Every structure is written in structure tokens, then in C-alpha cells.
Design a binder for these strands. Structure first.
Ligand SMILES: [Ca+2]
Ligand SMILES: [Ca+2]
Ligand SMILES: [Ca+2]
Ligand SMILES: [Ca+2]
Ligand SMILES: [Ca+2]
Ligand SMILES: [Ca+2]
Ligand SMILES: [Ca+2]
Ligand SMILES: [Ca+2]
Ligand SMILES: [Ca+2]
Ligand SMILES: [Ca+2]
Ligand SMILES: [K+]
Lengths: 109, 115, 112
RNA sequence: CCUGAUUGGUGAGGG
RNA sequence: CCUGAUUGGUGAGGG
RNA sequence: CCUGAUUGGUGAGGG
């Protein structure tokens, strides 16, 4: 589905303030398989898309929230990296309240 | 690490380190711990989770299981060494004589549940 | 006291104790060590009262072939063993210097 | 050779 | 061999 | 009860 730029900015902001996160397809997938992932953010410009094509299905199966952001380069920066990130998983939010809200807004779509 | 057979909550890890600190007689280090388990005098074996190469302590869980000796884990070898009264790390510790029988029995039971 | 030990040699006995890597302090631990055959040298204080507490040691060591000697005071022996109190007897399990022990055991074995 | 505790019961010293 | 960062958690290094 | 370290690995504490 498509997420509004307003929300994406909030998603990127959410990753930036998070206390603990996982960066990278391998670690994100593990975080979801272990169920320690609270929210999963996925980049829309991942090529080949096959790298993250399995995430949406896995999250729903594990009952974990997930949304998309336009830039993997932007997602990586929000994760504290100097390089891109195809996906990120928030393990410990920065502001519990905001997260619960952000998650609800996403679940709407 | 593959040698860590089960997850021990941080609160219980604290209890394990406390047990080591209050113990009347312990063995510290892989060689003395292994000798104690083989001699059958260990009552509880505590293994650090961050030992590398893992091969140094990987035999302990299996050995204890064979001897019917209780074992558990703590996250840091540095913390375990400190609890054992050292200024350095310890990959493992064996409690030979606990400080209080009842406390040990309760702790061992809590571990057997996590097991 | 089966034999007399020169003050100079008693000093060496006390120093051997202080330098040892592993010792047993006290009648029960000394006796257990001799019985288990891990004691290399037993030192007995001469002013133990009742003397019955350590009376068995000379015979036990002889029966085990373990070297033993005496020192004037239990207070000094205890201090040498690292205690703040007296010790009726001490057993050296692991000395600090092999050569020295062998030399001391010799000096004592000739005094007997 | 230089570095200098970044090492360490993952086994020192002694027997 | 040349180019020289155009590559990149899309998994380096380590165990 | 008083004395108050005169006691003490000549075996405390723990298992
Ligand atoms: Ca250090
Ligand atoms: Ca240091
Ligand atoms: Ca050695
Ligand atoms: Ca670039
Ligand atoms: Ca670049
Ligand atoms: Ca590729
Ligand atoms: Ca006194
Ligand atoms: Ca006193
Ligand atoms: Ca008495
Ligand atoms: Ca007792
Ligand atoms: K590393």
C-alpha cells in the first residue's frame, strides 16, 4: 500500500529516536521471526525488490506492524548509517505513545 | 552461542551472581570447573554467555547434563569473574559449598523451570 | 617432643610455612592431610596444652613416612601460617621452593 | 626493534 | 593490468 | 545476672 509523505516522515523520525533497532534484511527478518520487532519499516526503492519481498507476508503472519518509505538511502540515514538500508525494525521505541499512534495510522491503510 | 541451552532472565542472572559471591567454596575457571564436575563435587555450574572461542566451555552443558548437575548462565564473563572475587573474567564457576542451602535450592528450582 | 630442634632450624621451619603455596592449619586439617598422604612436612608446636591434642602426630607421621619437626610456640606457628591466633600444628602441602624444603627436611631428619 | 595494557582463571606463580 | 569510489546493512569484520 | 577479651585453627561460619 501507499503511505503519505507526512506519515513517512513520522516513520523515519520514529526510527531516529528509537532506543534499539535492527538494520538490514538479515537482522530485520530475524527480529520478526523472533517476534521482538514492534514495527518494521521497508524501503520502496529496493532493487532487486526480491530482497524484501518476503517481509510483508512474514510480518502479517507474526502479527507485526509494517509500513514503507520512499528512500532506502533515507531509511539508512534515519537508522544512523552512512549507507542505505532496505529495511529496519524498531525494537525499543523512543516514545511509546507516539509509536502506538503511528502504528494505528498505518494499520488504517 | 550454541552452548547456551536456554534464556535466563536478567533478574535471575543477578541471583546467580549473588549466589557465587555468597558461596563458601567455589572453583573458578574452565579447568577447575571441569575438574569439579568430573569429581562430582559441583552443586551448580554458572557459564558466561560471551566466551569465545565457544569451545572453551561448550562441553560444560553436556557434561553437567550427564552428571545430573544443575547449570545456568550469566551474560558477562567479566561480571562472573567479579562475582567470583577476581579482578578479571571467568568463563565459568562451580559452586561447591553454597552460602545458604535454602537459597540455593530455590535458585536451582527456578533454573530447572527455565530449562 | 621426640627430639629437640635448634632455634635456627625452628626459624627455617617457620619461614618454610610462611613461604608455602598451600598449607593446612589446625590439628584436624593436619591430621586429615597426613591420613590422605598429601602432607610433605608436619610442624608441631611444643607448648600445646592439653598435649593430647597433637600427641598422635609424631606416631602418625612415622607410620606414613612423613617428615615432622617442632617449634617452640603455637603463637609463632599460627602467625607463620598467616593467622592472628595460635595453631597447634601445620602441614605443608605445597612448599614455595622444592630445593629448600628438601634441604630443610634433611637437616631435621638428622636431628632425629 | 617499535607500541605500551588494547591482553587477561581462555590458567599466572609454585609443586 | 587500467580506471579510481561510479560500489555500498542488497551484510564488512569477527567467532 | 556480673565481669568484659583474661578466650582463641585446642575448630568459627557454612554444607
Ligand atoms: Ca581491561
Ligand atoms: Ca588493564
Ligand atoms: Ca601452569
Ligand atoms: Ca555514494
Ligand atoms: Ca563514496
Ligand atoms: Ca548484489
Ligand atoms: Ca590474646
Ligand atoms: Ca583479644
Ligand atoms: Ca577445649
Ligand atoms: Ca563445626
Ligand atoms: K569484532
Amino acid at each position: 500500500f501507499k503511505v503519505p509523505e507526512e506519515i513517512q516522515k513520522e516513520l523515519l523520525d520514529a526510527v531516529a529516536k528509537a532506543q534499539k533497532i535492527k538494520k538490514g534484511a538479515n537482522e530485520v527478518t530475524k527480529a520478526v521471526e523472533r517476534g521482538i520487532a514492534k514495527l518494521v519499516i521497508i524501503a520502496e526503492d529496493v532493487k532487486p525488490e526480491e530482497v524484501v519481498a518476503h517481509l510483508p507476508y512474514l510480518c502479517e503472519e507474526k502479527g507485526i506492524p509494517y509500513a514503507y518509505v520512499a528512500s532506502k538511502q533515507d531509511l539508512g540515514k534515519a537508522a544512523g548509517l552512512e549507507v542505505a538500508a532496505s529495511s529496519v525494525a524498531i525494537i525499543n521505541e523512543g516514545d511509546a505513545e507516539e509509536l502506538k499512534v503511528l502504528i494505528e495510522k498505518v494499520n488504517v491503510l
